[PDB]
Amino acid sequence: SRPILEVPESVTGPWRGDVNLPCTYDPLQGYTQVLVRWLVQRGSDPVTIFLRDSSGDHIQQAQYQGRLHVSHRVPGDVSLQLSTLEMDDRSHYTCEVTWQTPDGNQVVRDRITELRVQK
Known part of the structure; x- marks a missing residue:
C-alpha cells in the first residue's frame, strides 16, 4: 500500500565525529517523493533544520x-x-517524507529517533 519509513529508535554517535541518522524506505510504484524534512526537538516544537524539495536542498540555519x-x-x-x-x-x-500517491493526492509519514553522543 503506502511507503514505509525505516528509522531506528536510537542512534549513538561519537563525540567530535560524524553520525548517520538512518531514514530509509523501499520506493513504491506510483509514489513520487516531493518533500523531505528533518527536524530536531527543542521545546514545544520540533524545528526544521533541513528541507529537500524540487528546488534542491535547504539548510536555513x-x-x-x-x-x-x-x-x-x-x-x-x-x-x-x-x-x-x-x-x-x-x-x-524527526524524519518526515511526503509523497504524491497513485491517486494524485499526497501522504506524509514521519518517524522520531534519538541521537546520543558518546565520548
Whole structure:
C-alpha cells in the first residue's frame, strides 16, 4: 500500500565525529517523493533544520550549513549525516517524507529517533 519509513529508535554517535541518522524506505510504484524534512526537538516544537524539495536542498540555519548532509544517491535513502558532533546535538530528530500517491493526492509519514553522543 503506502511507503514505509525505516528509522531506528536510537542512534549513538561519537563525540567530535560524524553520525548517520538512518531514514530509509523501499520506493513504491506510483509514489513520487516531493518533500523531505528533518527536524530536531527543542521545546514545544520540533524545528526544521533541513528541507529537500524540487528546488534542491535547504539548510536555513548558519549553524548547520556545512555540517549537515542528507543522503541522495540511492532512491529511498534520506538518512541525515551530522558532522563534528557536540554534546548539545543529543536530541530527538524527526524524519518526515511526503509523497504524491497513485491517486494524485499526497501522504506524509514521519518517524522520531534519538541521537546520543558518546565520548
